[PDB]
Amino acid sequence: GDLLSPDSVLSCLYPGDHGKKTPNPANQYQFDKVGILSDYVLELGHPYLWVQKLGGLHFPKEQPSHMETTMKLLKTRVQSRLA
């Protein structure tokens, strides 16, 4: 079924993160400004947290060498799904 389907292969590399909610709350204010979402997530892509940690953007979490670790977790995830 949904093992190698491109929607939810990499949903929970880190524990949780849900694949759905936007990381920064300024996006929530900007959505509330123009009156406007998982359809847009499936259309454009999943905004995970580790993607933005690799991109350089640091956003505050709700409760108070990344590259090699994320690529190794991708290597483990692909082998686990194929197995």
Partner 1 sequence: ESVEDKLELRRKQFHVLLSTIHELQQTL
Partner 2 sequence: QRKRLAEKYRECLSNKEKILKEIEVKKEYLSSLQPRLNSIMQASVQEYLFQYETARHLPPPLYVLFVQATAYGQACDKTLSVAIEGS
Partner 3 sequence: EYLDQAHKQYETARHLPPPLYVLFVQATAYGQACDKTLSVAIEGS
Is 65 one of the binding residues for partner 1 (CB under 8 A)?
Answer: yes
Question: What token pair was written down for 38?
Answer: 């998982």
Answer for which of 24, 38, 69, 76 binds partner 3 (CB under 8 A) is: 24
Nearest CA-CA partner of 52 in 81, 78, 80, 14: 14
Cβ closest to partner 1, residue 65 vs residue 80: 65
Residues 34-63 that bind partner 1 (CB under 8 A): 56, 58
At 58, the amino acid letter reads H
Residue 13, amino acid? L
**Binding string to partner 2 for residues 34 to 53, with x set by CB under 8 A, is what?**
------------------x-
